[PDB]
Symmetry: C4
Subunit: 28 residues, 4 copies
């Protein structure tokens, strides 16, 4: 549970990296 | 079960980011 | 203990990638 | 242990994303 929580946080960071990468792509 | 699911989502996000960056590289 | 360590390395890698992409954005 | 292993794999993917990002930076 401590672990699953940190996993969820991890995955939210990867969704935020995905956003950054979609943005740089749309701008081009 | 939940943890495993999250681990697999995480990894699969990492494969996508990796391939989006390699694709980017290539068009540039 | 090991797991926690790895979780913290992982998260900290994600913060760095996020900030390297935001920095990139900004210079572009 | 199954978990720590997958964490190690996760982190190796983040080192590989880091490489991709150092490369795109050196090329500029």
């Amino acid at each position: 549970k401590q672990i699953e929580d940190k996993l969820e946080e991890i995955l939210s960071k990867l969704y935020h990296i995905e956003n950054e990468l979609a943005r740089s792509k749309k701008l081009l």
